[PDB]
Symmetry: C2
Subunit: 139 residues, 2 copies
């Protein structure tokens, strides 16, 4: 409770975002090393990526006291988690990805705009699957 | 249309941050569902998390030439990837995590301050390991 509204809450959200991206980045770097045949480098990136998973996990555990960094909604139980995932996916397909696609098209990046539209379609599908799972949940 | 400096470059970085966090959040939610015995919700979170990994990979593919979301540095080859990883980890241990630790301590969240300090030390260790890997890289 004391954490809500603090600068530390904001720092935990920022650090969660950074560590989440670090895992994704390090896995991407590992996949590039795979193709290069840099097998030791790939293993190092995968090991450090696992460290970033633990860091992000810890940040999110502290944030369970205040809300999901992506939606502000409570998280913990599957009911709460599904409700938050639905809100996030709905934001992605309604606003974020279509907005990014329009700007990509405005700026002349047609392939990127189509990519964003593909991800809007994916987010709509994921929102609908989460909604169905929530409907079926008896707790 | 030049991607570097465009609004679309910034949107790719932002979308990458969101998809990265989505994977981390969804794996956390999947583990909560495991404990509750909600096996299908757990699998659904894991399946959707795997989709988020693909989305993040696709965003990074577009960003290779313009710069790593975390550092602004070019990425793609193992040498570039190690240089960028070192830069990012060095920022975490010299600036980001120490600053977050100081703020948490000032706000009275002593355990969280120690958590940030632990992560500063971890980032220093990551930077050191990446530096040794770069120093011996055969490319």
């Amino acid at each position: 409770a004391q954490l809500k509204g603090s600068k530390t809450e904001e720092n935990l959200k920022y650090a969660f975002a950074g560590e989440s991206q670090a895992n994704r980045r390090y896995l991407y770097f590992a996949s590039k090393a795979d193709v290069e045949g840099q097998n030791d480098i790939a293993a190092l990136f995968r090991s450090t990526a696992e460290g970033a998973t633990g860091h992000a996990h810890g940040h999110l555990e502290y944030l369970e006291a205040v809300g999901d960094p992506a939606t502000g909604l409570p998280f913990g139980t599957s009911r709460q988690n599904l409700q938050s995932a639905i809100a996030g996916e709905t934001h992605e397909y309604t606003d974020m990805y279509p907005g990014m696609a329009k700007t990509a098209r405005d700026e002349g990046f047609e392939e990127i705009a189509n990519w964003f539209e593909t991800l809007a379609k994916a987010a709509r599908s994921h929102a609908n699957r989460y909604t169905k799972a929530l409907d079926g949940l008896v707790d």
